[model samples]
Structures are given as structure tokens and as C-alpha cells.
Target chain A: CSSDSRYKRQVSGDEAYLEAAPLAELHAPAGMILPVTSGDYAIPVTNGSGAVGKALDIR
Target chain B: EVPDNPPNEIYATAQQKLQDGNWRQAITQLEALDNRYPFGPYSQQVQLDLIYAYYKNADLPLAQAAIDRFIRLNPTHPNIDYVMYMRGLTNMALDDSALQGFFGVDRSDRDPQHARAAFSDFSKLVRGYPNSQYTTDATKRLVFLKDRLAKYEYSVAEYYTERGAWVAVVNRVEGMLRDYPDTQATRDALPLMENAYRQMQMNAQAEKVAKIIAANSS
Candidate 1:
């Protein structure tokens, strides 16, 4: 069997399950997740170029 | 006490519950309305309200199911953009909960099914309805998601590099560069590619990537 596993679908819910090894290995400082998209759903990413980097004004 | 006699009255009570931040009550009243009069005057709005109610209650599975049902039934509804936006938000929330486990593990190691789904939902909202009121927030979330996904690939590339799998590293970096060009993760990918090429004894490829990184940074 192939050792590579990333997108493998697990037998739970409709969504697939990610592998557990890397997750077990990674440990962040104080467990703060990266890319930090946890608060204020109204605000867009505004730190880079392209539409992905700028926040749009809806009003 | 909401009366079961009239669907309209029940729906009104549900709306009140929603306004009062009583998501569970809203769900109960809405579920009653849905059962008693599946095709009543408040049916459409009730379906929409249940989605918001479930979302607010953090019942994501139910929220996702409700929104999917709403979209299926009202594919061309004028408020479809809002539905799509809510789905994206729900998926984002679900993803957050899933990522809460372990040692703040990188997303690449985890299944990003929810993130990918959220990205698609947001992309659809933006692409199909550019002028949508929800477009602004959706776009912002998309930017974050793009970065998240690119970072996932970047982490995987790093893993391969450390394992001395130069070819795998090259593939992962190239995929990141192609799909997420302007994101921060893409900027970080250049050095990884250069390193992979150097490890594989490909001086020309390594030099090319170094020049590109230098050009972009300057």
C-alpha cells in the first residue's frame, strides 16, 4: 500500500478525514492556529495584492 | 406560549426568538411551523430563518443541511446569494472547530474538506453575484482561505524537503505557485522550490527560481 495519505476519505460524516501523523507532530506556541481567520466574519483579508488581499466595501 | 393553531403566528414567534438570541427556541418554533404547514405563507422565510438560527446555535450539521435544502428548493431565489454566503460561513466555523484539536497542527496535515467546500461556496457567491451585499465578506474569507490552502501546500512541501524528497517538494511548490500566486504562502514557496532544485543537483532550475524570487521581492 502507498504510504502517502492526504485526501483520503474516512468513514465518518460526508467530509473526508485528514491524516493524523502530521497533526500529531505540529505543535504551535500556546496552540494558536495559523492564518488566523477566527474572528469578525465581515472583514476580508487586506494584507496582499489581488482581490484576495483587499477588503471590499459592501455598503 | 406560541400557538400551534396558525403557522403565521408560530413563524412570528420564531422570528422573535431569533431576535432575542434564543436560537434553540427559534429552531423549535420553526420546526413546528415546518411540520404543521410545510407550504404555509411563512414556509420560505421559515426555511431561511432556520438556517440562521441553527448557525447561531452552533449546530453546524443542521445548519448545513437546512441551507442545502433551501438552495435545492429555491435555486433561483433572489436571496440565493445570502444562502450561499451563510453556507460558506457555516463551513468556515466547522473548519475552525475541526482545527481546534492537536498541537495547532498545520492545515496541510488535516483534511481541508470544509475549507475547500467553504472556498467553493464563497467563490460561487462572488462569481455568480458580484454585486451581492454578501460579496464583500465572502471575498475576504476567500482571501483567507486561499492563504490557508497555499500554506497547507507549503507545509507539505517542507515535509518533503526534510525527507529528501526533492521531486515531491517541486511538485507541491509548483502547485502552490500556480493556484495561489499572490498570497503570502506563494511568496514563501519560491525558496522551497529553489532548495528542492538545488538538492536535486539542478543548478539551472535553482538559479531561475532564485532570480524570480529576487525580482518579486525587489
Candidate 2:
């Protein structure tokens, strides 16, 4: 019984071959707008985007 | 009719026309007075009026020449800012009169380059005449012009950014910040540069920039 199990054809499986590819796919969706788009990205999230002539309230 | 004897009354009439914005008539009257009554008591005032009239008509060179004559003759005059203000106006009038493609509008004779120069001239007035009645208004105009120039630089940075020229955008924004370091525009430039650097995968530089902004704010 042990010989029968040992004689079974060895199947090749490589864990290293399954290495994950660099994730080029970002989460930004279509029509998705960023908050900022000028200089260095200070904040990770976006802010301060709007249409012209829009009345904004300020304190 | 027998003799060409223009009097103080002639200069007074010209001054009135100038006040009314009748530049041509004022010029004619001033010319007549200066030619016929060259030695009158109001000669200096007439010359001043002539310089102002020329200025009102947007004749910069003529106005400047008149001012130069005034300065050469009255080096010790008390109301010298009047002439200096006009002199500044002359340089300003000649600075950036070309705006053919500023707004894509076919403005044949419309130009605003003088605005900056005008601001500088107005600045000179404020500096030279701190106690002048015109100082307050001149200072206001200077601030207005400075803001306008700052906005122009900021807009250029925006334009460059929209075109995906990140380096160009950063440099221009940096230029504006350096040029108008103490302006509100510099604050805006900081945020703008932050976004650009972030997009370029330059988070480290961006963080450095954020720290600089904090320092500035403090």
C-alpha cells in the first residue's frame, strides 16, 4: 500500500510561480474626479473641486 | 483781434475744458495761451494742465516730454509728485500695450499691459508722497494691480498643469510663489504644487512642501 502511493505520478506545483503581479489596476472609476490636481499631493484624498460661477459660502 | 494777447482767462478756460474731458479744445486753448501769453503768472499752471491733458488723451510721449520739461525747470518745486506720478504713468503706458492673444478675443485697440506699470507708477506716488491725498487711492490701485498680476501667473500655472506638463507647472508655480512670496496666490500655489507632485509619484517632495506651507502659516 505504501509502494502504490509512492509510485503515483508526481504532479509539479510551484508556489513561487504564483507570485502576484504588480497591481497596475487603480481603484479610480470612470468620471471619478480628484480633489486636487496641481502641485505635490499633500493629502492622500482629493478636495477643492467645483464649477465656475458657483456661489460658495465662506466663514 | 488787433493783438494776440491770451491772458490768465485763457488758461482758466482750458482748465475747465480739461475738467470736462474736452481734451482737444483744452489742448487748443493751452497752445494759444502758451504761445501768446508765455510770460503770464499762470504759465506754470497752464503747462501742468497741458501735461495732464495730454495724459488724459493717452498721449504718453507728449505727456512725458512735458513732465521732463517741468522737472528740468522746477527741480525745487513743492508739488513734485504731480509730475512724478505722470512720469510713472508714461512708463506704465508704454510697458505692455500688446495683448493680441491674451483672451483669444480680437480686441483691436484694447490693451491692459499698462495696468502693472500703472501700479508701479502709483506705488512711486505712494512712496514719494506718503502724506499726499492721492496716496490712499494710489495704494489701493497698487494692491489691485498686484493681485491682477498674481492671478495672471497663477492662471499660467493652471494652464500648464492641464496640459500634463507637470514639470512646467511646478516651475511656474514656484516662480509665482517666489515672485509674490507674500501674496495670497502663494498659498494657492502651495496646494496646487502639492497635487502635481502627488500625481507624479513624488509623495516625499510633496510632504516636504506641506511642511513648508505649515511653516509659512505659522
Candidate 3:
């Protein structure tokens, strides 16, 4: 890696928040019960370029 | 004797505020009580009241957080049914907004992310607690949100049609037909699919859809 200044965040928007640690998952203490994971709300495959708005009205 | 703010006293105050239907003050007092007395004598009831108060105050973020924490701590708790039902309601409310359709826009054309989440929550609630006191209402909302999600798909397919993304249009329409045939959108979605197939020059597929559309016409 070159020692060039990667002031890319200078050009890009704010990225300071990335410096913080990631939030932990919801894990209850050992004595408590944890909720089970489920795919009840799993999304089906769709075309990525689908649109939204007035143009979406049926012709 | 100095009057110290005991846990029970704070809980009693919060409980009274809740019963009085003062949701805003109830939320404030309940939060204070929960923060001051974690796993106290009245911890369970305090958290329950806090979630309910947050919901009544239209403060869905805190309500959702409370539910998440409770479900983590006690998934099998007797009050879980109510909490889950409230969770679904919170998600549904979060999907709505004050400015989404300010200019007379059709809401169904908007993104269905939170609607999908609410649908999943209600489905899980119904499956896990068939005879739950909240099941009847949850069932109703399931129908409503299912139709909403279907309409959302149809609208997106319509946009794909406008974009001349033939494969994308065909994929969305095919999925909607299979997954949401009961909606009125399915009836018109055939034409979109037929046209998409035609544009893609898959005449055999287009001809098949044409016949199916004709068959449904009568």
C-alpha cells in the first residue's frame, strides 16, 4: 500500500460513525430465554429495477 | 423520616398514570421506573406498561425496543401474545408516514419494506398462537397487508413495463400471479406479462399467456 493520503472521506460524505463498534445482537443473560429466529417475513426474489410512484399507475 | 422514592412507589405512580390513560406521562414515569429498578419487584409489569404507554403515545421506536427486549428476556411469557400483536401494529404504523403521499400520491406504489415486516410479524403471531385473544384482529390485518404487498408488486411491475425491462417485468408479473392471484391486480397482470414476453420475442410464452388471458375473459 502506498503512503499516499487517503483523504477519500474528505471527498465522500460523513464516515466518522464507522469508527464506532457495531451494535451487539439481542442476547439475554444466561438465566433468561432468548427468542428463536424465524423466516416468517422472508422476501421473495424480485427484479431489482422495479419502479415506484405515479408512473407505476396501470396503463 | 425522609421520603425516599421506593421502587414500589414509582411503580404505583406509573401504574396509576397508565390506568388514567395519560400515555405521555405514563411513558415518562414508566421509563423512569424501569431505569431505576431493573428486575425489581414490579419489573415485569413496569416494562409491559411502558410498552403499552409508548404505543398509545405513538412512540413506536421505543415501543418496538421494549418489545424486542421483553421477547429476548422471556419468549414464553404469558404476556408475549399481547407484546407480539403490539409489535406487528408498531411495524405497520412505522410503514405509514405524514409526508409519503402529501401530493396525492398512491401509497401502494411506495416501498413495502415495513409492510413486509408487519406481514411477517402477524403471520408468526397467528401461527404460534392460534387461539390468542389477539389472533382475530391479527388475521384481519394479515389479509389487509397481504393485499397491500400484492398491490405493491403490481405497481412495481407496472414501472418495469415503463422502463422496457422486459425480463424484469416478466419476473415480477410471474411472481405476483403465483403468489397473489386472488388480488384484482392478477387479472390485469396477465397483459403485462404477455407484453413482456412478446417484447422479449418469446412468442411461445406470449401465446401461452394470451390463451390464458382469453380463457379468463369469459
Candidate 4:
């Protein structure tokens, strides 16, 4: 990795937290609880998205 | 024979007695402190500590009385609002009452009455003390309790909808949405309400509700 700051900080005039934003409303649908192993990870699948993906469908 | 300068020492001694499992003596110590001080900060704290002692010592009535007095006198006391909140909590904790556990059957498990009371009590904590330190945690608990209540209501609504009970479905939906607008149960309830109205041939109202849900993104 270079010593220079490779990642430019994204700038926006937002409220700085997602919970207070326009898209901050509750998004999880029924029969679904969001899953994440560690923090800061998510895989969202809405009801209309399609049939539920079988876990480990490597075919 | 020296008088106590600060009453924390009394509270400390009472807490020690409680730790030693001498709950009755702990209650006596706190009672003496409250009697001597009559009205003060420590008196309020003693009232709180006495609630714990009384409950531990199996004096439920005294515990309830202390909770009532604490709320009535120090309604604005920070952290003291949890006293009244804890009254409902302790009742739920001691739900081994005859009615709750009749004929060796755990009625408390099947009956939603105690859970509903706990929900209402926490709802009061949030509505009354919106700015208190308890507000954040209370809000979180309120969400979970509301979800549970909504689930119960939804089960009833679902059964009625299956039986073509449109009016009953409507009533249940209104009650569920009134209390738990942001819950997942409400999220699932939208499609059910639409179907319930459609089944009753109320096409116009069903379309209107659909539009509202579309706009509200529920």
C-alpha cells in the first residue's frame, strides 16, 4: 500500500447518519431478519426479489 | 452518639446487610433512615433501596407502597422513575401467583396478560419521561413489546380473515396499527388488510388503502 491517502473521503451535505435521512425508515419485512456474521455486513432480499436463495447453491 | 453527616453511610450499611441475605434487617435500616430524614435526596434513594429489600423480604405490599410514594413525591427525580417502572417489573418477576400458575399449569406462559401489562408500563415510561435517560432504552424495549403484541393481534386477524370475517379483520388491523405502526407485523398486515377488504367487496376502500400504503411505503 502507498503511503498516500488512497481513499478520498466522500463528501455530502447529509445528516451524517443514515437513521435521520429520507431512506432511514424501517426496511426489514416480515419473515425476514437481517443477517450478518460480523458487524457492518448485510445481504438483503425482498419478498418480490425472487424465490429465496438456497444457502450454498454453488451450482 | 454523633449524628450522621451524610446518609449514604446508612444506605451503604443497608446494602451490605442485603448482600449478607439479611433482607428484613436491610429493610429496617432503610426504614429508620427514611423516618429520621423525612425528606431529602437520601430519603428518596432509601425509598428505592427499601423497595428492593421489601421485595426480597417477601413484603410485596410494602414494596408497592414504596414505589407509589417514590413516584408521587419525586415524579421528576432522575433515575427514580424506574421505581414505578420496576413495580410492574417485580410483579411480572413474581408471577407465580395462584391465578398465574393454577393447578400446576403455567398460565403466565399462555396468557398474554402479564406481557401486555409490562408493555403498557414501559410505554408509560417512554411517553411520560420522553427526555429522561431511560428514553433510549425504553424506546428499544417498546419496539420489541409492540412487535409481540402486534404478532398476537395479527394471529387473530389472520384467523378472522381466513373465515371471511372482514369486519373483525378491520377492527384488529386498526387496533394493531394504532399501537405498532413501525413493526414488522404491520408490514405483513398491509397485504392482509387489502385482501380482507377485497374479500368483503369493498373495492373502493381497498384501493384507497393500497394507495396510502404505497405512499407510506409500509
**Top model by TM-score, which number?**
1
Measure candidate 4: CA RMSD: 17.3
TM-score of chain A of each: 0.13, 0.20, 0.25, 0.17
RMSD of 2: 27.1
Model 4 interface RMSD over true interface Cα atoms: 20.3
Model 4, B1-218: lDDT tens per residue? Answer: 21253456766776666666566567667776777656556776677666666666656557667777777756767645365345534443433245434357543234445446645554555555554443433344334444445566677767777777887776666545554555566556656766778887887767655664563344
Weakest 10 consecutive residues of candidate 1 chain B by summed lDDT = B209-218
Clashing pairs in 3: none
TM-score, candidate number 1: 0.72
Worst 10 residues of 2 chain B by lDDT: B105-114
In the range B1-218, model 3's lDDT, one tens digit per residue, is 11136767766777666666566566667777767656565666666665567766666777778888678756767666566566776777777555646588776667667767776765666665545554444555555565677678888888789989988887777666545544456557767878988988987777767775654321
Candidate 3 CAPRI grade: incorrect
User: Relative to the unseen true structure, what is the C-alpha lDDT of residue B181 in candidate 1, on a scale of 0 to 100?
Assistant: 54
Off by over 4 Å in 4: A1-59, B1-13, B28-41, B54-62, B84-124, B207-217
State each candidate's clash count.
2, 16, 0, 0
* Best by the DockQ measure: 1
Q: Write the per-residue lDDT of candidate 1 for residues B73-134, one digit (tens) a residue.
A: 66767666667666776676666565355776554456556777777777766765655665
Candidate 1 residue A28 C-alpha distance from true site, Å: 33
Higher-DockQ candidate among 1 and 4?
A: 1
- Highest lDDT: give the candidate number: 1
Q: Model 2: residues >4 Å from true position, as ranges?
A: A1-59, B1-9, B19-21, B35-41, B56-65, B86-112, B215-218
lDDT for residue B166 in candidate 4, whole number 0-100: 82
Q: Mark the regions of model 1 whose C-alpha exceeds 4 Å error after superposition.
A: A1-59, B1-4, B98-111, B216-218
lDDT of 2 by residue, B173-192 (tens): 77665445444665666656
